[PDB]
Design a binder for these strands. Structure first.
Ligand SMILES: [Zn+2]
Ligand SMILES: [Zn+2]
Ligand SMILES: [Zn+2]
Ligand SMILES: [Zn+2]
Ligand SMILES: [Zn+2]
Ligand SMILES: [Zn+2]
Ligand SMILES: [Zn+2]
Length: 114
DNA sequence: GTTACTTCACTT
DNA sequence: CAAGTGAAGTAAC
């Protein structure tokens, strides 16, 4: 009912890119999925609220992993595993479900490497 | 066969 | 307890 309200409210394109299997195509990878998500929520304030994924500066974002794992279709645990293995660096302990982050070359208008 | 995850049942 | 570990798996390429 919640994921249903989340995905049902975001564009078919994003739902599909989120559903797409991760291969060697860089757009199919987790960083760019996070990035397209982040980029889009930037324009949908209401959804950005409900989900909890937004930039706090040109280089840091905060999120509610519990909700982000949902809209992305992955267990909480795999979300953490992906942040860990892709070199996202946590800048804050969980507080009311919010966590903060940064990753080199991952900004408002850039997603580097792979 | 490779790659880029994905998941689970613990542990910390 | 939120987040990490180690072993095992999945499927597009
Ligand atoms: Zn982007
Ligand atoms: Zn689902
Ligand atoms: Zn094979
Ligand atoms: Zn415990
Ligand atoms: Zn591991
Ligand atoms: Zn393995
Ligand atoms: Zn394996």
């Amino acid at each position: 009912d919640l994921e249903a309200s989340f995905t049902s409210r975001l564009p078919p394109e994003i739902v599909a890119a989120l559903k797409r299997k991760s291969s060697r195509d860089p757009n199919s990878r987790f960083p760019r999925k996070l990035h397209m998500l982040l980029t889009y929520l930037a324009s949908n304030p209401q959804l950005e609220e409900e989900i909890g994924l937004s930039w706090i500066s040109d280089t840091e974002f905060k999120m509610k992993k519990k909700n982000v794992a949902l809209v992305m279709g992955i267990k909480l645990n795999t979300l953490n595993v992906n942040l860990r293995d892709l070199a996202f660096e946590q800048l804050q302990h969980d507080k009311g479900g919010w966590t903060q982050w940064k990753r080199s070359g991952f900004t408002r208008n850039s997603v580097f490497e792979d």
